[PDB]
Amino acid sequence: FQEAYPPLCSSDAAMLRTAHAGETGADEVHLAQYLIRDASPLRGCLPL
Amino acid sequence: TFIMPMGVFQANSMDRYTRHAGDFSTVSEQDPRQFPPQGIFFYNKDGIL
C-alpha cells in the first residue's frame, strides 16, 4: 500500500503520560511540542 | 530487593515542571520545593511512614 503507520510518539516526556495511575496522555499540542497519537495496528497491544 | 534513589536532582529545566499553578503553595515568598531533595519517604511493613 506504500504507507507507514505512526506510533505513539511525542516531543516531550511530560505529556506522554498523565497523573492518574493508569492510562497515558492524550493532549495534542501543549505550547510548541506535540503528541502524535497512536494509529498503528498495535492499538490494544504492547503494554506500556 | 527494593532500590530507591535519594538525592537525585532533575538537571534539565524542562523536567522541573508543575502540572498546575496552585498545587502546593505556602506562605513563604520562596517556594521550598525548588531546592534539591535530601531524603526519601516510604511505607513500613505496617503502613507506617
Side-chain angles (χ1 to χ4, degrees):
Chain A
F1 288 122
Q2 314 276 117
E3 78 176 348
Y5 304 109
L8 171 60
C9 77
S10 68
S11 173
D12 206 14
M15 71 187 94
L16 203 47
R17 43 152 161 90
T18 187
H20 192 72
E23 82 287 326
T24 81
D27 216 346
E28 264 167 18
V29 294
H30 169 256
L31 192 43
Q33 272 76 16
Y34 40 86
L35 181 135
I36 298 182
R37 255 169 306 179
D38 210 352
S40 48
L42 307 179
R43 278 183 227 92
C45 315
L46 277 296
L48 302 153
Chain B
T1 75
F2 304 111
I3 62 170
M4 293 176 70
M6 293 177 70
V8 178
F9 182 80
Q10 300 177 176
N12 198 2
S13 168
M14 171 95 88
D15 206 349
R16 292 186 273 113
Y17 63 71
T18 175
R19 284 211 41 71
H20 285 120
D23 277 327
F24 290 121
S25 305
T26 47
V27 67
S28 176
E29 83 292 331
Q30 269 279 351
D31 216 327
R33 296 193 199 293
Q34 278 147 65
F35 312 137
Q38 302 189 16
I40 190 166
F41 296 87
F42 54 91
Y43 290 168
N44 206 293
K45 163 188 172 294
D46 292 327
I48 318 292
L49 188 151

